[PDB]
Design a protein around this ligand. Structure first.
Ligand SMILES: [K+]
Ligand SMILES: [K+]
Ligand SMILES: [K+]
Ligand SMILES: [K+]
Ligand SMILES: [K+]
Ligand SMILES: [K+]
Ligand SMILES: [K+]
Ligand SMILES: [K+]
Ligand SMILES: [K+]
Ligand SMILES: [K+]
Ligand SMILES: [K+]
Ligand SMILES: [K+]
Ligand SMILES: [K+]
Ligand SMILES: [K+]
Ligand SMILES: [K+]
Ligand SMILES: [K+]
Ligand SMILES: [K+]
Ligand SMILES: [K+]
Ligand SMILES: [K+]
Ligand SMILES: [K+]
Ligand SMILES: [K+]
Ligand SMILES: [K+]
Ligand SMILES: [K+]
Ligand SMILES: [K+]
Ligand SMILES: [K+]
Ligand SMILES: [K+]
Ligand SMILES: [K+]
Ligand SMILES: [K+]
Ligand SMILES: [K+]
Ligand SMILES: [K+]
Ligand SMILES: [K+]
Ligand SMILES: [K+]
Ligand SMILES: [K+]
Ligand SMILES: [K+]
Ligand SMILES: [K+]
Ligand SMILES: [K+]
Ligand SMILES: [K+]
Ligand SMILES: [K+]
Ligand SMILES: [Mg+2]
Ligand SMILES: [Mg+2]
Ligand SMILES: [Mg+2]
Ligand SMILES: [Mg+2]
Ligand SMILES: [Mg+2]
Ligand SMILES: [Mg+2]
Ligand SMILES: [Mg+2]
Ligand SMILES: [Mg+2]
Ligand SMILES: [Mg+2]
Ligand SMILES: [Mg+2]
Ligand SMILES: [Mg+2]
Ligand SMILES: [Mg+2]
Ligand SMILES: [Mg+2]
Ligand SMILES: [Mg+2]
Ligand SMILES: [Mg+2]
Ligand SMILES: [Mg+2]
Ligand SMILES: [Mg+2]
Ligand SMILES: [Mg+2]
Ligand SMILES: [Mg+2]
Ligand SMILES: [Mg+2]
Ligand SMILES: [Mg+2]
Ligand SMILES: [Mg+2]
Ligand SMILES: [Mg+2]
Ligand SMILES: [Mg+2]
Ligand SMILES: [Mg+2]
Ligand SMILES: [Mg+2]
Ligand SMILES: [Mg+2]
Ligand SMILES: [Mg+2]
Ligand SMILES: [Mg+2]
Ligand SMILES: [Mg+2]
Ligand SMILES: [Mg+2]
Ligand SMILES: [Mg+2]
Ligand SMILES: [Mg+2]
Ligand SMILES: [Mg+2]
Ligand SMILES: [Mg+2]
Ligand SMILES: [Mg+2]
Lengths: 91, 274, 44
RNA sequence: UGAAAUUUUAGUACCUGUGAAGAUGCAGGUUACCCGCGACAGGACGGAAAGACCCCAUGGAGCUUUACUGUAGUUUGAUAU
RNA sequence: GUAUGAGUAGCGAAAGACAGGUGAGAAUCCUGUCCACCGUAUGACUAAGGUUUCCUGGGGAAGGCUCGUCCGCCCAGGGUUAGUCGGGACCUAAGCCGAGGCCGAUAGGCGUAGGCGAUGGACAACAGGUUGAUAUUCCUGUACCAGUUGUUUUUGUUUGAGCAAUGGAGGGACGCAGUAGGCUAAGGAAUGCAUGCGAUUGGAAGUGCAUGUCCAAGCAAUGAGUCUUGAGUAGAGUUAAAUGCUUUACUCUUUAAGGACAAGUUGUGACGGGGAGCGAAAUAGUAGCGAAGUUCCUGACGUCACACUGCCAAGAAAAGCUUCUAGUGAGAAAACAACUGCCCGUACCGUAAACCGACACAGGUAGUCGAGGAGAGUAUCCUAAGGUGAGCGAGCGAACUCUCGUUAAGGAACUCGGCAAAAUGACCCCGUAACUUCGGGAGAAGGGGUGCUGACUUCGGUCAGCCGCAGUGAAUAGGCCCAAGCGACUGUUUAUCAAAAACACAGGUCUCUGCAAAAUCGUAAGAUGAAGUAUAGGGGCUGACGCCUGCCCGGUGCUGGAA
RNA sequence: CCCAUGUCCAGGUUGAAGGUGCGGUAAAACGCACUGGAGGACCGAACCCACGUACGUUGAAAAGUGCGGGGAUGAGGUGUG
C-alpha cells in the first residue's frame, strides 16, 4: 500500500495525550501495516525520527442502535516513540 | 534360573519369574534401536482385527539381524541383553570392521565368542551357514524360507530344529512343531538352539502382569448375548448347546483344520504335526 | 455431572470447519445444501 | 414478589335404597343459619401415564433352529488365460 | 388470549448490627465501627472456555426470584503496547493429507516420496516503578540473543586464513521404585537489631507491648559435590574423503591422573530499589521523607537429579547443537561506535454470578503456590496474608414434616432384617486363639497409661506432690467375636432402581496355525496378527492353590480313509 | 476401547528377595542378628468411586445433597491431540 494510506488518523484520548507528554503519538493505521512500515510512513510524513513503534490490534466492539446490532470496524493502533533530538509532531 | 516369590500377598502368591542371570547389561545399543507404537490389535481402518491386545508397557524395537549375510569378518559377542519384543534373549556383537549388530542368543552362547557366517564357517553354536553346508543331524534355528530374506523359523525362546537329510535342491528339516518339511538348500540357519529355554516355566501370577505384557482380558463367548457370540444367551450357565464349539464368527474351535487345502507348500511338507 | 458439550475452538473447527467440509464430497453436499437453503452461516 | 398440575357448568351434606349391579347431584327419609382461617386425608372409582398384566391385529421389532426360500463366504470340477 | 388453583407453593445451603451519608424514595447503595464466615480455601496465580462481561461517567424502562439511589444489566466514552513471555518465520510423536503409484460399477479406498500436526524437544531479561483501566510489553536501571554499516588492531590472500554440507559421525535421548546426602527457599525462637509507646480495670519502666527485621537477571570468582579410566601400537570400517566417528587384537595406566558437569555461595549490579512508620499543602494519607534488616533452631522428592541403589513390565522421534572432511574460498576475526530486529495473543472472569449445566442453578471444571499453634500430615479445631457476610425480610416461638441435642427404668422385647441411631475410635505399653498356602489370621481378642507442678535422670523414665466427675478434658480417628453358603485373591459391571454368587483374573486343558501362518477389517488394493515365528499367535471351555477328574465313540460334530 | 504425549497421588505403617556378620558342620543343610526396601501390601487426606440410609422427588439438581462407605503405586487417576 501507499505510505500516505498506511496512517489513517491520530488518536486523541486521555491515554494518548499522556503519551504525547512522553513524546509518543498514537495513530490508527491500516490493519495490514506492520510496525516497520508504520515507522517508514511516519518518518516520510512528519520529518521526525522514530525511536520505537508499539502496535496493537483493537478488536471490533459490539454495538446496537435500536433493533439492529452489529460490530464496529476492527482497528490497528500504533504508539510511535520519537527519539530525542527530533521534531515533535503537531496536531 | 526361575525364582519363586514368597506368598507375601495373594497377588504375589505362586508368582514366578526369571532371575535374568544370563542378562549381562541393561543398556541397549542406541544405534540399533527403533521406535515402536502399540497397535492394540487395530489395522489401518482403525477397527479391532485381533482381540485381547493393547495397553501395557512401552517398547523400543531392537534391529535383529536374521539375515546373517556378513560373511567377510567374524563377530565377537559383547553382551547378552533382554529384548521386550521377543521371548528369546538377544546378543550384541561387534564385527571386526566395526559394524554393530543384534542376533538371537543361542543356548550356551557366551560373551567373547567369535561367531562366523558363510559357507566356510565351522559348525559351532551361533555360526550361520547355508543349509547345504550343515551336516545331517545338526540342531539349528533362525531358519529362513527364502534365500536372503532372513531367518523366519525357529526364533522363539528354547526352540530348535534338526537337519534330517538332503534331497535335490532342498534339505529335510524337522521343525520345533514336529513337522517334517523341505527347505531350499540355499537358505541359511544358525547352529544351536535358541536360549532362554526357561521362558516357558514362568508363572505370571497376577492379572496386572498380563496387562503389562499387553494382553487385555479375554471374555468367554458363553457369557455374551446371542447377538455377540454364537455361544451367547441362555438362562444361567449353559453348555455349548451347538453341534460344536465355534469362534465369535462361527468357525469351529475344536479340531477343525484351517490350513488352505490347496496350499502351495504342501508339495514341500513331508510329515505334518499340529 | 459432566455435560455433553465441552467447548473447544480447535475441535469445533477441525470437525465442523469449512475446510473439513470441503475436504470430502459429502461435506461439499452439506455446504451446497446450506447455500441452497440460504443459511447466513454455512459452516462452523 | 409470585407459579403449577387440574378444571363440562356447579348454590358441590348423611343414611337406606335405586341405577351400567360401589351416587354430592336419582327416590324416601334425616340433618344443615351465611363467609372464612388453621389442621387430616375417607370420597370425588382423586391427579399424573390412550394399562406394561390378560386377550385381540391375518401389527412391529430383537433372538433361535434339523421351519421355508435365498445368500456372503468356504470348498470341488469344467472351461479361458 | 385469558382464567382456576391463588394472592397459594416457591423466593435456591451461612451473621449480621447500628451510626453517618446520598437520595423523591434506603433492611438491600456508599463510608465508618464492632461482630461473624473461609483460610490445601471461600486466598494468590494461571490453561481451556466465554468474548468486552475490564475502566470512567451517567440511568433505573426491562433483567436481578424482594428492594434498589445499586450491578457481571442499559446509555456514552475509554482500555489489551514484546527481538527475550506463549505461538508462527525451529523440530518431530500419534494421527491426518498425499505428486506419481496400487486397487475399485461410478463415487472413490489405500499409500510412497514430501508435508501438516503438541499435549513433547530447542530457544536471548531481570528487579523496581508507573495508570482508572496494560505491563518479563510502557518507564527507570542494568542485561542478553541475531544481524548490518563504520573505525581501529590484528592476518590471508589460490603451499590458500576462513566458511562448511542435504553427506560420515557424536549428541540430543528419556522407565519405575527406594532411601541417603548437599544446597536454597520456607517456617520458627530470641532479655539480637530498629522504630513507636507506658496502659488506666486491680498490677507492671521491665525478662513491658506493637510493628519491621531485604533485594534480582546479567557479569566476575568460587563452588557442596556428581559422573567418567586414560593413553599407545597394529589393523578393519565408515557408498566418495576425513585429523571426525565405529570397532578387532596387543602393550602401559586405572585408591589415581586427566576430562565433563554442578545446585548454590561471595562480590558487582546497589550512591539503586524496597521498607516500619512519619507525613505535606493548594485537597489525600496522596506528593515527599524514611530506621533496622543479626544470631540460633527446624529444613524440604524445591534443586543437584533419574545423581546413586535396586527392579522388570525394559522405558519417543526429529531438529537445534558439536565435529569430520567433501566442497567453497579472498577476505576473515577481536575491540569499539552507532544502528536494525516482523506477524498473532496480551483487557477481564477463571473450585465461578463471566466456563459446561436453559437460571446470577447446593453439580462438574486441568496445572501451580497454598502460612502459624497442637499435629506424622495438605487430617482436625482455631487463626495469618487475603477474601467474604451468600439478592427477600420483620414477627410469633402451635400441630405436622425435616435437621439436631438430652432422656427415668428396661436393653432388640422393634423389625422381614439391630434399618437407623448408639457404642469403638489418637498415641504409648502389656498381651493376643483356632486355623494356615507358614506370608498370615493380627490393630485378633482382652487389658493398662495419658492432665499439671517440682526433683532426678541413662533424656525414656523414675519418684514426690497438686487438681477435677472426667487429663488424645474440645475437633479429627476401627466396634468386636463365633459359625455357614458363594466367589480364591486386588480388580470389572447394568451413566440414571441390581456392585453380586455375575465378568475378569493368574493357573489348567483342548484345538488351529510352518509364515504371503491361522484369525480379523476390506469388493480389491492395503492392513492388523508382527517388524512376531510353534516356549509364538488365534479360538473354545474351565478358573488361585490342594486331592482328584470315573464309564460310553451307538447317535451328532470334527479328523482320517478311498475301494 | 485404544494411540501418542504430559501430569497427579499429604502423611504414616509393614518388612519379601538379596547382602553382611555370628553360630553350626568335615563341608554343609540350617539357625540367629544386622542391613535391604519388595508389594495389583496395610492405615489414611487430596483424587477416583458410588455400598447403606434419610431427605429430595412441579427437587438447589432431567440422578443430587447430609451422615456414614470403598480404592487410594496401580489392571491407577487425569489433561492435551
Ligand atoms: K496369585
Ligand atoms: K523378553
Ligand atoms: K476368559
Ligand atoms: K448364559
Ligand atoms: K440461523
Ligand atoms: K357406567
Ligand atoms: K381425602
Ligand atoms: K425393540
Ligand atoms: K395461569
Ligand atoms: K387465581
Ligand atoms: K451508577
Ligand atoms: K509447550
Ligand atoms: K567448522
Ligand atoms: K536468565
Ligand atoms: K548475583
Ligand atoms: K496483559
Ligand atoms: K509443629
Ligand atoms: K494447616
Ligand atoms: K439482599
Ligand atoms: K406463630
Ligand atoms: K412434630
Ligand atoms: K418392647
Ligand atoms: K422373621
Ligand atoms: K478375628
Ligand atoms: K485420673
Ligand atoms: K481407627
Ligand atoms: K464374582
Ligand atoms: K477368581
Ligand atoms: K472351588
Ligand atoms: K463391591
Ligand atoms: K458382569
Ligand atoms: K483346578
Ligand atoms: K486358552
Ligand atoms: K466345554
Ligand atoms: K485362561
Ligand atoms: K458316542
Ligand atoms: K462318532
Ligand atoms: K448418598
Ligand atoms: Mg504485540
Ligand atoms: Mg486372545
Ligand atoms: Mg449375560
Ligand atoms: Mg448367532
Ligand atoms: Mg447357548
Ligand atoms: Mg440351568
Ligand atoms: Mg341393583
Ligand atoms: Mg348405592
Ligand atoms: Mg337436583
Ligand atoms: Mg385416576
Ligand atoms: Mg389402551
Ligand atoms: Mg390452598
Ligand atoms: Mg438466597
Ligand atoms: Mg481441611
Ligand atoms: Mg464493572
Ligand atoms: Mg458504573
Ligand atoms: Mg425488582
Ligand atoms: Mg495416504
Ligand atoms: Mg487488571
Ligand atoms: Mg490501676
Ligand atoms: Mg570410500
Ligand atoms: Mg533435597
Ligand atoms: Mg491479565
Ligand atoms: Mg433411656
Ligand atoms: Mg423379635
Ligand atoms: Mg413382634
Ligand atoms: Mg447400621
Ligand atoms: Mg478429645
Ligand atoms: Mg470376588
Ligand atoms: Mg474388591
Ligand atoms: Mg444403576
Ligand atoms: Mg447401586
Ligand atoms: Mg465359570
Ligand atoms: Mg494397596
Ligand atoms: Mg476432577
Ligand atoms: Mg485406604
Amino acid at each position: 500500500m501507499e505510505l500516505l494510506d498506511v496512517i489513517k488518523r491520530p488518536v486523541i484520548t486521555e491515554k494518548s495525550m499522556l503519551a504525547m507528554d512522553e513524546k509518543k503519538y498514537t495513530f490508527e493505521v491500516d490493519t495490514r501495516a506492520n510496525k516497520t512500515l508504520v515507522k517508514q510512513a511516519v518518518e516520510s510524513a512528519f520529518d521526525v525520527k522514530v525511536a520505537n513503534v508499539n502496535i496493537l490490534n483493537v478488536r471490533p466492539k459490539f454495538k446496537r442502535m435500536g433493533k439492529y446490532a452489529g460490530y464496529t470496524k476492527k482497528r490497528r493502533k500504533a504508539i510511535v516513540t520519537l527519539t530525542e533530538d527530533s521534531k515533535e509532531i503537531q496536531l | 534360573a526361575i525364582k519363586k516369590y514368597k506368598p507375601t500377598t495373594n497377588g504375589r502368591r505362586n508368582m514366578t519369574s526369571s532371575d535374568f542371570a544370563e542378562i549381562t547389561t541393561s543398556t541397549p545399543e542406541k544405534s540399533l534401536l527403533q521406535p515402536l507404537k502399540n497397535n492394540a490389535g487395530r489395522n489401518n481402518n482403525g477397527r479391532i482385527t485381533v482381540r485381547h491386545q493393547g495397553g501395557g508397557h512401552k517398547r523400543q524395537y531392537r534391529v535383529i539381524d536374521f539375515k546373517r549375510n556378513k560373511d567377510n569378518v567374524a563377530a565377537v559377542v559383547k553382551t547378552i541383553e533382554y529384548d521386550p519384543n521377543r521371548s528369546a534373549n538377544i546378543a550384541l556383537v561387534h564385527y571386526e570392521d566395526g559394524v554393530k549388530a543384534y542376533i538371537l542368543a543361542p543356548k550356551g552362547l557366551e560373551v567373547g565368542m567369535r561367531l562366523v557366517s558363510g559357507p566356510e564357517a565351522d559348525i559351532k553354536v551361533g555360526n550361520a551357514l547355508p543349509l547345504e553346508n550343515i551336516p545331517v543331524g545338526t540342531v539349528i534355528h533362525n531358519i529362513e524360507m527364502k534365500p536372503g530374506k532372513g531367518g523366519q523359523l525357529i526364533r522363539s525362546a528354547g526352540t530348535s530344529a534338526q537337519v534330517l537329510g538332503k534331497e535335490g535342491k532342498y534339505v529335510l528339516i524337522r521343525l520345533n512343531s514336529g513337522e517334517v518339511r523341505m527347505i531350499l538348500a540355499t537358505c541359511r540357519a544358525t547352529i544351536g538352539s535358541v536360549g532362554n529355554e526357561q521362558h516357558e516355566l514362568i508363572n505370571i501370577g497376577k492379572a496386572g502382569r498380563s496387562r503389562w505384557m499387553r494382553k487385555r482380558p479375554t471374555v468367554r463367548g458363553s457369557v455374551m448375548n446371542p447377538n455377540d457370540h454364537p455361544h451367547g444367551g441362555g438362562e444361567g450357565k449353559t453348555p455349548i448347546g451347538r453341534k460344536a464349539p465355534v469362534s465369535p464368527w462361527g468357525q469351529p474351535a475344536i479340531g477343525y483344520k484351517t490350513r488352505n487345502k490347496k496350499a502351495k507348500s504342501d508339495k514341500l511338507i513331508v510329515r505334518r504335526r499340529t | 455431572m459432566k455435560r455433553t458439550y465441552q467447548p473447544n475452538k480447535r475441535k469445533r473447527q477441525k470437525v465442523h470447519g469449512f475446510r473439513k467440509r470441503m475436504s470430502t464430497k459429502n461435506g461439499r453436499r452439506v455446504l451446497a445444501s446450506r447455500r441452497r437453503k440460504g443459511r447466513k452461516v454455512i459452516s462452523a
